[PDB]
């Protein structure tokens, strides 16, 4: 099988900048290489066929070149909708093989997160479980801290984080931190606070509620 | 490495 | 308009069989060949096989024994069947069509089929409201305790997309998945507008519409 090595693993650029994706073959494959785009939760999308040939509906800002073992996919002016993974595929040799792909991240101005805290619903408390959700919305960069406090007691090990991929429009991230307690534990305490640390904040922001208002 | 949840590379 | 639509996301017991149906439109299966490609954490994109216009089949080397592709030209359906699944067979499976009948540049893809190989049983999720309380209100739904992935979440039957963030599912210690889907709206619309998250967990046929109001 033909081994396709894509470099780098991660690319980080700014909107309007040129960017080049590398794809190297273990041996000469002529120009029998295809490129693909894959956005979040999407299927691969054909960008370029046979090293340089254009594809219908594909923006003119996408082009490709190279021959033999060294190939290059180029975006002359990156837009926020270009945020995706990019794969290369060879078919000069059977069977057709794909590269490991390159992740394209976009840089932008620092954006402070908007913080919202959500108490557990009365509907869930019937199950004997309580989920307290903290929302960090539309921020940049990805790095952020979420510290949970229950009656001034530092919570640890009982929370989980989920982070959205970069937004295709404003290039921001959103984060959700979920504090999970038993209904017994939740009922024994009053003040539930969520402290957020981020570069866009000159001070940690705390959203909190008293159980039962 | 590919993530089945988001169909994106981590 | 050329389209390929695969069957619903599925759970497969260890050492059991996997079956996916690819239904096509916009072209005839007698004119084009249908390929099958999977995507896994450990192996990335991987070409599996193809059934050609004439009915001939090619299977990639490490699948020749347990792979089986069939079709019905009349019903425009392609049948993918792989035997003896193990954990590292857990991946997203695609059916695809090339630009030209003989070639391999995949310009058309199915939406994908997330296959999870596990002995565990299917469980529908519970949906709980994230009730709202600078003129912008945040609200959402808590989709908790389900298996396996995936679950689809929309807002107001697809009419609401602006400001929606559906977070990636996280695996809890219980072995059950959980996610939240949020959306920012004008706080003055909480009295006028109705907000419903449309939750669908096809592996368990659990379909729930959850109305989210201020408590």
Numbering used by the authors:
A (entry chain A): 1 to 213
B (entry chain E): 2 to 11
C (entry chain B): 1 to 133, 139 to 220
What did the publication describing this PDB structure actually write?
Recently, a unique binding site for a cyclic 12-residue peptide was discovered within a cavity formed by the light and heavy chains of the cetuximab Fab domain. Here, multiple crystal structures of meditope peptides incorporating different cyclization strategies bound to the central cavity of the cetuximab Fab domain are presented. Collectively, the structural and kinetic data presented here indicate that small perturbations introduced by different cyclization strategies can significantly affect the affinity of the meditope–Fab complex.
Other cyclization methods, including the formation of a lactam, reduced the affinity but not to the extent of the linear peptide. Flexibility and geometry dictate the special organization of the β-alanine linker, which has the same number of bridging atoms as the disulfide-linked meditope (eight, including the amide N atom of β-Ala1 and the carbonyl C atom of β-Ala12), while the aminoheptanoic acid (AHA) linker is one atom longer and the diglycine linker is two atoms shorter. As the distance between the cyclization region of the meditope and Val9 and Ile10 of the Fab increases, so does the dissociation constant. Of note, although there is a significant error in the estimation of peptide concentration for AHA-, β-Ala-β-Ala- and Gly-Gly-linked meditopes, the off-rate is independent of the peptide concentration. We speculate that the increased atomic radius of the S atoms is responsible for the favorable hydrophobic interaction with Val9 and Ile10 of cetuximab Fab. As expected, the affinity decreased with increasing distance between the linker and the Fab (Cys-Cys > MPT-Cys > AHA ≃ β-Ala-β-Ala > Gly-Gly > linear peptide), underscoring the importance of van der Waals interactions in this region.
